C-alpha cells in the first residue's frame, strides 16, 4: 500500500499527502476550526479565537507568576493576561496595517476591513475570556 502520495495529484508541489496532512480527521478538525469554518464572519472568527486564547492566558500568570503565593495572585494574573492581550491585539492591528494596505473588498480576513473586524473580535473575546477564567478560578471550589 501507499499512504503517502502527491498533494492534489501534483508530484512537483512541495508537499506530500500523508495521513497527518490529508486524513479525514485532520480535514474535519481543521475545516471546522473557527479560522476555517464555513459561514462564519470575520467578527465571529476573531470572537471565538479571542475567547479561546483569553480563557487560558490567565493561568500561567496566576500559578507561576511572582505573586502566586500572595492573596492577590488571581488579580495579578488577570491583569497580566489583560496586558499580554493588549500586546497581542496591538500586534494584530499593526499586522493588518502592514499587510492589507490597499484593500476595499471587505468581508475577508485577507482584507483591511475583515482583518479589523477579526482583530476587534479577538480583543473583546480575549478580555472576556480572561475575566471569565478569573471568575471560574475564584469559585473553583464549586466543582
Amino acid at each position: 500500500s501507499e499512504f503517502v502520495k502527491p498533494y492534489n495529484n501534483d508530484p512537483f508541489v512541495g508537499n506530500l499527502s500523508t495521513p497527518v496532512t490529508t486524513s479525514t480527521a485532520t480535514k474535519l478538525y481543521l475545516g471546522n476550526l473557527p479560522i476555517y469554518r464555513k459561514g462564519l464572519s470575520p467578527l465571529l472568527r476573531g470572537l471565538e479565537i479571542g475567547m479561546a486564547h483569553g480563557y487560558f492566558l490567565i493561568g500561567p500568570f496566576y500559578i507561576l507568576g511572582p505573586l502566586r503565593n500572595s492573596p492577590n495572585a488571581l488579580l495579578v494574573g488577570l491583569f497580566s493576561a489583560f496586558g499580554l492581550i493588549l500586546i497581542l491585539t496591538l500586534g494584530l492591528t499593526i499586522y493588518g496595517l502592514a499587510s492589507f494596505q490597499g484593500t476595499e473588498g471587505g468581508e475577508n480576513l485577507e482584507s483591511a476591513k475583515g482583518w479589523r473586524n477579526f482583530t476587534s473580535g479577538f480583543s473583546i473575546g480575549a478580555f472576556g475570556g480572561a475575566s471569565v477564567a478569573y471568575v471560574l478560578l475564584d469559585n473553583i471550589s464549586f466543582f
Partner: protein
Amino acid sequence: KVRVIVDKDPVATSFEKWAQPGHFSRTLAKGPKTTTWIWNLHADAHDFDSQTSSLEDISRKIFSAHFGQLAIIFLWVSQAYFHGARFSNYSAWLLNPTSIKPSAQVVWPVVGQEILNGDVGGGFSGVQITSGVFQMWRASGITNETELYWTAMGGLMMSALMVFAGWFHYHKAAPKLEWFQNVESMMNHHLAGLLGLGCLSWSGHQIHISLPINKLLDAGVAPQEIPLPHELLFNQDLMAQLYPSFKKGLLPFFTLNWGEYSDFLTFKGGLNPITGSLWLSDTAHHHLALAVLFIFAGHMYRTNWGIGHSMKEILEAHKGPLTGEGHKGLYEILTTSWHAQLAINLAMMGSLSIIVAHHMYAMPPYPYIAVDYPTQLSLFTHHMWIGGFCVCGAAAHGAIFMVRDYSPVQSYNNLLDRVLRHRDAIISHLNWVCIFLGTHSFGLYIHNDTMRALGRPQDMFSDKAIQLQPIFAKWVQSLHTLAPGNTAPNSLATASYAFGGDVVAVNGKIAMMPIQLGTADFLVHHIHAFTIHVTVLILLKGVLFARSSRLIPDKANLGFRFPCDGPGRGGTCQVSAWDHIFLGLFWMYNCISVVIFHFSWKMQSDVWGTISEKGKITHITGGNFANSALTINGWLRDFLWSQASQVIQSYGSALSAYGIIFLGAHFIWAFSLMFLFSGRGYWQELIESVVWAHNKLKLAPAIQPRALSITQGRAVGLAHYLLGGIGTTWSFFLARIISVG
C-alpha cells in the same frame, strides 16, 4: 559459493613510488607548482576511491590499511605492557593498591623536568598514570614483571606479523571483490568466530587464572607466594581447594547439571566489598554466556550449505504502506559502497564508546579502580570524547556516500528516496525541537541566575522554590533497586549501587554510592538532550542536503568538500556537507564538554569522597552540586573557578606539567580562532607582500607559496580549536583529580 579467490603478485615491491610523492592521484602525480599541492598530497592520501575506480583495488587497499592499523595498535598494547614491566611500580601497587599512586612513566633529568618524577609511593619516582592498566593487569591476574615483559614481546611479535600480513595481502596475494562481498560469511565468522570464541577464551582464562589469583590476593596472600598460572591451570586439587565445584570435573558441564558450578559461576551482582569492583566470578559467567550467545547468533547467514539467511531477502521482505518499497536496495548499497558501511560502523562504535563510559563508572569492573578517582574520570571522559568523534565521522561518511555512491536507479522509492523526499520536514521539525529544548533547558538556568541576582530564591527553579523533579528517572531507579528480589530473583544484589542500596567503600575512600537525581539533574539532562539534538540537526542536515538543496540544485556536482558556490544567492557559504560536519564537530565538542563537566561535578560532590568509621560521609566538594548547579554563575564559580586552583597552583610540583599543558591548550584554542574567523584572501595578499620581499632578494621559491585553501583553513581552525579545548579539559581534570583524590 562462498570461496577464497585471490590474485597473486598484484603489486610489485619498490621504493620508486615512495620517491614519487604524489603518485596516488593523477593531478598530484604531476608535481608541485604551489604549496597547496603539498597540503593536497596529505588531504587525498587515504581517499582511495578518488585515486582508483576499481572497487576491488579500493577493498584491497582498505584491507591492508586495516592490517597496518592493527600493527600500530599491537605496538601500543606492547608499550603499555612493557612500560608496566620496566618503568613502573606495579609490584608496589599490587602489594598496597590503595596508598600507592599508579605510575608507569619516568622522565630523564635534563632541563629540570626531573621534578615531574613525583612521589608516587612504593619507593618509586615517576609520572602518575590514570589509564587503569594497573587495575586491568590485577584483574587479569598478572603478579610479576616477567609476565608483563613477555606479553610485551608477544605484542611486538604480533605487530611484526601484522605488518607482514598487510604487505602480503596487497603485494603477494590480494583478494578479489567476490571475496570481499561475502558479507554473510563475514558476519558468521565475526559473530561466532571473533566475538564468540574471544569471549569463550577470555572466560576460560578468567575461570582458570583470574579467579584463583584474585581470590588469594583478596584473602591476603602476597604476590610472591601466589601459585603461578601454569601450576593453577592443571592442578585440579588446588582449584578444588579454592572452588569446591572443580573436583567434579567437566561431567557436570557435559551432563546438564550446570548448577554444580555455582561457586565460580555466579549471578551475585553488586561490587566485591574487598576490591570495590565487580565480582570476577560474575564476569566469568558473563563472558561465558556472551560466548554462547554470539556463537548461537553467528549461525544465521547463508554460506556454501543450504541453511542460513540471506540479508537481501530479509531486507526486501520489510516494506510497509508508509515506506513504499521499504529496504529494497540497501543490501546492494552496503555491499557496493564502503562509505555507507563506514558510516554505520562509526556510528555504532561511537555510541558503544559512550555506553562504555556510562557503564564502567557505575559498575567498576577492575579491582581498586573505583577508589582510583583519576582513573575513573580519565576513562569516562576519554571514551565520551572518542564516542563523539566517531559519531561525527559516521555523519561525514554518510554524507560522502550520499555525494558519491548514491544512485536513484538503485535507490528509487526505497527508504533512502523517501527520506530525501521529505528532508525539509525532517530538518524543520528537528529545528523546532532544538529551539524548544534549548529555550527551556537553558532559560531555566538563565531564569535561576536572574532571580538569584534579583535576590528572589523563592522564585528559583530550585529543589525548594519551584521543583522540577525527574519523576521518571526516580521511578526507574526505584525499580532497579527493588529488582534483585522481585524481577531478578537469582540476583543477590543490584546491578549498580548508583540506583540505590549500600555505600560501598574500600578503606576510607568511597567506591560507589547511590546517585540522587533532583532539579539540577533534570536541568543538566535536558541540556544534554538539547546539545545532542542540535548536533543531530547539523549532521543530519549535512547528510540529507549533500545532493542538493533549494539554494544549490546541483550541489552534488561540486563535490563532497568544496569551499562555496560563490557570493551569489546572497552567499552560498559552507553549503557543503563537509562544512556541515565542520560545524557539527563544534557542537559535539560542546555536548561532550558539558557531559564531562556534569560527570566531574556530580561525582565529586555526591559520590566520591571518604567515609569514616562511624559513617561520616565527606565528599570532595561537599554536595554543592544540588544547590550550585542551578545557575550558570554557580557553574562558573563552584566548578571552574573552585577546581582550577589545583591546576593553577601546580607550578613547582609534579603537576606543573599539567599547568603548562593547561596554558598551552588555552593558547592553541585561541590560536584556532585566527583560522576560524579569518579568510584566505587577506592571507594570500599578505603572502604576496612577503613574496615581493623574497623576490627582491632573489630567493622566492620555485614552489610558489599560497594561503591555505578555504576548506583547509576551516579544517585547521577546527583541529586547533578541538585540540586546545580538549587539552584544557584534560589538564584541568587530571591536575584537579590527582591533587584532591
